[PDB]
Nucleic acid binder design. Structure first.
Lengths: 380, 255, 123, 242, 147
RNA sequence: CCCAUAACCUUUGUACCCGUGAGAAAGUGCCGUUGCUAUGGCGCGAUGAUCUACCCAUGGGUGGGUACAAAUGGCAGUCUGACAAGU
């Protein structure tokens, strides 16, 4: 006598009402197990009654967590109070199939008059419901159970392990790869700025040391035909009239016999140089961001060597974890130079281990290893 | 008129290629850097620029669920991304990480805008340098022709067959040397007319197009007093068009 | 409140048993002694079982070894005292983790297997 | 056996497993998250015919997987196909759950189950790289505490070393395994019982399957790769074992 | 609400419509529409009660606190549940704090629009003391004090 | 399109080079605190001791191996040539 059953789902609770029991003594035979599987007989057995869907991902997480330990959440109490009829606590309780013997006494202590059954026959029915899924629901299951299943599994497991940023290092890896690409494109696009500006004007493209400030100079100085002493002092407000480059290349522009190029071409040189300027600035910003994220993630390593070098290692060895797993000699950083390097290798492997497995790690041990290798270098 | 230098054109084509490569790799990095908060967004909206603008608009999945996004999406795609926003398997992210992802996404938008600017520049510039050939074959393929063969003048002096086979030299010299049937489209294959034909008519239209392009080029690189109206391009285009209608009218199979 | 990460240690009885067998292995060259020597052996795959001190300053620099041990089903036990492990291994200095390696030309095979069971029940 | 030497891919008898012929033959499976190898195995790249894209395959090490040992020894029918769901008990890490997700492919799933926490954490990061591996970090003795997260999986692969490995597989396959669904068991006899003969351990464990209503089809000892293991391939029958 | 409507305005069973309402709130403890409607019904009922009192008189601060206790628990539930919506650093924590405050002021200003009357609004502002919004609050305060 | 929008190869520019697991050194020994004795601390190591081509008496000039850049340096030579379609 199994009057109702309670199926908890990735979304919401459902309470089914049984109509025919299956037999009890002959519960094992081939005929009766094949009727668990085949849907004509199962729909003779179970008729859906009620279904309260969960309210959000946060409650579905919380309620799965409560089922996992054993107590009864308020939504489960709500639906049970809606569906069960009020019978005597001594004579003829209302039965209920559940699939968790430990979930028994929590239900029983709330409602005194509900006797929870989980025998072979109840387990049988619950298996049947889980197999026949969503056909039984007459369409009510709003929401895609498959995607709910994925999300709920991930959220519950992530919360059991307390997954977070300070141990997350994939940010360090991606920042490294993107920094290398930025510097590659920056020097390439510097080459092309310098070539267009040189093709009308070779000598600043030979005589400016820094390509970034050259890009500022292209953004300010339009061409060799736009020249004045206020621009001289604006370069002085920029890098150096101390060198006298501004005056000298006024002379060079007065002697520069390159093509006086068209205005539209000058505007596109302008745009491309400005774009390079924005990119290089962005690179510097990301570099500082990388330093800060490292001081969160693996402070001891960073203080032991240097932030960007710790980044190099983490990207090589693949992640912080694999850096920890790595044998302390085969870690490679970049005669007696070889010996100090190998000693430092041992040290930085150990410091990486302490960063990996701690929580909010030990800049004091960053300092300890720092002074130790400093003494060895002092010997060297 | 100093606005005629094939040198700036040919290096412009090279830089256009570089732009395409770098833009794709940066959006790859952004899509998976962010998907580490919102995973299935990439697969649902595969476009780089649309992705970057989504990252500018929203920053948190539920923030997107509240916010309009439909400026840059069709609404069914909007519904998918809103629901997957409601339940991703993804995490939440801290503010500094959203900050630098955000700055990356706007930098992606800026390369897209820069490329469009460069192509508009190039189209106007080709209209200035070789407006007949531009008016015939389309200015992208015209610029690629000039880029490959180098000087506009040397391209003028090539015959018409070699303008047909200006792109496919590897397959050409392999076929010639090993006694095999030489390739037949070449670099013109991306013109709109040969992208308009069907089969053997693609091969035939590439002959007619290469010949009329040689006329157009020679009128452009040598006629010192050019009126810049591209009329030889327009005339010969009308000729090639009419050819295409005749070929595609003909029906190979019985009535 | 939950289990600390040094779990499992050993009782005094298991402690003296293990220190006994690790001494006799060090006599007969079945013992790879020290942190990264234990690590290299757990990468090669040729190690019976792992003995890790829990006294070490800090705990963490050897705490990396339970990952590989549980990756390869090779059992590990914390002994309490690192100078007791130096005691048993018979080298002059505190050894934070030693590892008893596999072999068959071994006068101490079945003694090792007995203690390996005792560990794997303790887990 | 070098960083440049080419090989000729070919497909196996199984579904979703490939062989890389060459001077020496590799058992390989197609990657899902490309570029990034997980446990250092040498992945093999190919080019395939939109302008083309490089696609990439991964070598499967038998000495570090107790499943590719079974394959590379010979199995009549393995129950993992490229469309299915594999419940995976005892998933210590990527070392094999990655490859099972490669041969399950994007349509199916693999529900990796593990109890401890540090391998759990590593499993979570990898699972974020791979969309199929739903990580469950619960004890496997009690399936009832995650009966909401899993539905009706189509094979159960089992890698525990517990001495009650029979009862744990029986619980999980009653709860979840679809009827007539494959069950792949990696017995390690020294762990399951350390005193008796390894054969005796196999007879007892196979027997317990049979009165747990898993008809065992097939049994292999996987000898040159490991000593004393045996994978038993069986079928959950549930309606008349005979 | 449809069920409540049919049992109250057709058959007049205060027990029945009451029980409908407390049950439905146990099922949905985070919908302002339902909270609104329950406060509404209690007002309608007590207005019928008070008119029954004056018509008995013609032929021959407790209820407001009922409504406002409903308001109090309504605010508690709404705050808690819209915290659980969006559920981890200090800046976004404070950001959800102000956003949730914004949400609850929106619906409580709605409650004002629902709205003896000045006594009720007094209890509302008591609830409030228990920046721009501070200004908007106090300009409403002087406006209602005039009113 | 298997990519002449490329690869090779030479040539120029820019870089580097030949696991092991237990040994290492041969009242002061040191510095300083104390007046006419108390001494402050230091005096190795599994939390890693010892091992991984040419000339001019720690120089430069040789020599090849690996990686980044360029080139109007190469491989490397630009298809056919009068008929076709309708009735």
């Amino acid at each position: 006598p199994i009057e109702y059953l309670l199926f908890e789902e990735p979304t919401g609770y459902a309470v089914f009402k049984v109509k025919l029991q299956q037999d009890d003594i002959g519960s094992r035979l081939k005929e009766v197990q094949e009727q668990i599987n085949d849907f004509g007989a199962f729909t003779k057995l179970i008729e859906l009654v009620s279904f309260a869907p969960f309210k959000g991902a946060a409650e579905a997480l919380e309620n799965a967590n409560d089922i996992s330990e054993g107590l009864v959440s308020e939504s489960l109490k709500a639906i049970l109070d809606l569906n069960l009829p009020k019978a005597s606590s001594k004579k003829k309780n209302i039965t209920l199939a559940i699939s968790d013997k430990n979930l028994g006494p929590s239900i029983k202590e709330e409602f005194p008059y509900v006797d929870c059954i989980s025998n072979e026959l109840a387990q049988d029915l619950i298996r049947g419901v889980r197999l026949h899924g969503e056909k039984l629901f007459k369409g009510l299951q709003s929401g895609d159970l498959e995607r709910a299943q994925l999300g709920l599994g991930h959220a519950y497991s992530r919360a059991k392990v307390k997954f977070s940023v300070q141990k997350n290092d994939n940010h360090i890896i991606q920042a490294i790869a993107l920094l290398d690409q930025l510097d590659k494109d920056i020097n390439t696009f510097a080459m092309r700025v310098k070539e267009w500006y040189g093709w009308h004007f070779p000598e600043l493209a030979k005589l400016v040391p820094d390509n970034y400030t050259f890009a500022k100079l292209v953004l300010f100085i339009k061409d060799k035909a736009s020249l004045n002493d206020d621009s001289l002092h604006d370069l002085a407000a920029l890098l150096n009239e101390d060198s006298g480059i501004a005056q000298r290349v006024i002379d060079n522009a007065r002697i520069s016999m390159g093509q006086d190029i068209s205005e539209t071409d000058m505007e596109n040189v302008c745009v491309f140089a400005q774009r390079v300027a924005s990119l290089a600035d962005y690179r510097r910003q990301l570099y500082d961001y990388l330093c800060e994220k490292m001081h969160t993630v693996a402070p001891n390593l960073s203080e032991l060597i240097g932030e960007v070098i710790g980044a190099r290692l983490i990207s090589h060895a693949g992640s912080l974890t694999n850096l920890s797993k790595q044998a302390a000699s085969t870690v490679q950083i970049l005669k007696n130079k070889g010996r100090i390097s190998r000693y430092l290798a041992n040290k930085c492997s150990m410091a990486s281990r302490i960063d990996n497995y701690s929580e909010e790690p030990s800049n004091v041990f960053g300092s300890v290893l720092k002074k130790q290798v400093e003494q060895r270098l002092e010997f060297y | 008129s100093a606005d005629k230098v094939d040198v700036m054109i040919i290096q412009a084509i090279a830089l256009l290629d570089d732009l395409d490569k770098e833009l794709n790799t940066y959006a790859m990095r952004c899509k998976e850097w962010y998907g580490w908060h919102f995973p299935e967004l990439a697969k649902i909206v595969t476009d780089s620029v649309a992705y970057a603008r989504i990252i500018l608009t929203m920053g948190i999945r539920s923030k997107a669920s509240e916010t309009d996004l439909s400026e840059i999406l069709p609404e069914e795609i909007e519904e998918r991304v809103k629901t997957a926003a409601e339940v991703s398997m993804g995490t939440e992210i801290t503010q500094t990480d959203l900050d630098n992802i955000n700055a990356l996404a706007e930098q992606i938008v800026e390369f897209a805008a820069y490329r469009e600017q460069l192509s508009n520049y190039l189209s106007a510039r080709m209209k200035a340098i070789a407006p007949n050939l531009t008016q015939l074959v389309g200015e992208l393929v015209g610029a690629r022709l000039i880029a490959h063969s180098g000087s506009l003048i040397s391209l003028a002096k090539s015959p018409a067959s070699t303008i047909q086979i200006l792109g496919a030299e590897k397959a050409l010299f392999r076929a010639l040397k090993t006694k095999h049937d030489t390739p037949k489209y070449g670099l013109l294959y991306h013109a709109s007319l040969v992208g308009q034909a069907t089969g053997k008519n693609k091969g035939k239209i590439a002959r007619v197009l290469a010949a009329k392009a040689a006329v157009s080029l020679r009128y452009d690189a040598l006629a010192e007093d050019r009126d810049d109206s591209g009329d030889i391009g327009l005339e010969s285009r009308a000729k090639v068009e009419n050819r295409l209608s005749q070929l595609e009218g003909r029906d190979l199979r019985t009535t | 409140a939950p289990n600390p990460k040094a779990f499992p240690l050993a009782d005094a009885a298991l402690t003296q048993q293990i220190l006994d067998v690790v001494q006799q292995a060090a006599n007969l060259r079945q013992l790879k002694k020290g942190a990264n020597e234990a690590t290299k052996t757990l990468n090669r795959g040729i190690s019976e079982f792992i003995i890790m001190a829990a006294d070490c300053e800090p705990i963490e620099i050897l705490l990396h070894l339970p990952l590989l041990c549980e990756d390869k089903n090779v059992p590990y036990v914390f002994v309490p005292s690192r100078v007791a492990l130096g005691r048993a291994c018979g080298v002059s200095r505190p050894v934070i983790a030693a590892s008893i390696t596999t072999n068959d030309a071994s006068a101490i095979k079945t003694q090792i297997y007995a203690v390996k069971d005792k560990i794997e029940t303790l887990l | 056996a070098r960083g440049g030497a080419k090989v000729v891919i070919e497909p196996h008898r199984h579904a979703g497993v490939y062989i890389a012929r060459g001077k020496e033959d590799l058992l390989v499976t197609k990657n899902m998250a490309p570029g990034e190898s997980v446990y250092g195995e040498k992945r093999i790249s190919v080019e395939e015919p939109v302008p083309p894209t490089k696609v990439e395959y991964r070598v499967w090490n038998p000495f570090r997987s107790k499943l590719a040992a079974g394959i590379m020894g010979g199995l009549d029918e393995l129950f993992i196909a490229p469309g299915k769901k594999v419940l995976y008990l005892g998933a210590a890490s990527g070392t094999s759950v990655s490859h099972v997700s490669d041969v399950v492919g994007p349509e199916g799933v693999v529900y990796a189950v593990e109890f401890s926490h540090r391998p759990g954490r590593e499993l979570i990061s990898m699972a974020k790289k791979r969309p199929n591996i739903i990580p469950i970090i619960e004890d496997a003795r009690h399936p009832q505490k995650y009966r909401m997260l899993i539905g009706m999986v189509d094979c159960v692969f089992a890698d525990v070393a517990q001495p009650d490995q029979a009862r744990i597989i029986a619980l999980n396959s009653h709860m979840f395994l679809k009827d007539q669904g494959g069950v792949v068991i990696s017995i390690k006899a020294n762990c399951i019982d350390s005193t008796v003969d390894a054969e005796t351990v196999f007879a007892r464990e196979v027997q317990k399957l049979r009165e747990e209503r898993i008809k065992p089809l097939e049994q292999l000892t996987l000898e040159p790769y490991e000593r004393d293991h045996c994978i038993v391939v069986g079928r959950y029958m549930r309606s008349g074992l005979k | 609400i449809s069920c409540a409507k049919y049992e109250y305005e057709v058959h007049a069973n205060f027990k029945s419509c009451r029980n409908i309402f407390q049950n439905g709130l146990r099922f949905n403890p985070d919908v302002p529409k339902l909270w609104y409607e329950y406060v509404k019904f209690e007002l309608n009922f007590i207005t019928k009660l008070i008119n029954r009192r004056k018509v008995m008189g013609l032929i021959n601060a407790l209820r407001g606190d009922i409504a406002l206790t409903i308001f109090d628990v309504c605010m508690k539930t709404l705050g808690k549940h819209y915290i659980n919506k969006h559920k981890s650093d200090s800046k976004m924590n404070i950001e959800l704090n102000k956003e949730t405050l914004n949400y609850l002021f929106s619906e409580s200003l709605r409650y004002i629009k629902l709205f003896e009357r000045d006594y009720l609004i007094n209890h509302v502002l008591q609830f409030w003391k228990n920046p721009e919004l501070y200004l908007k609050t106090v300009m409403i305060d002087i406006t209602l004090n005039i009113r």
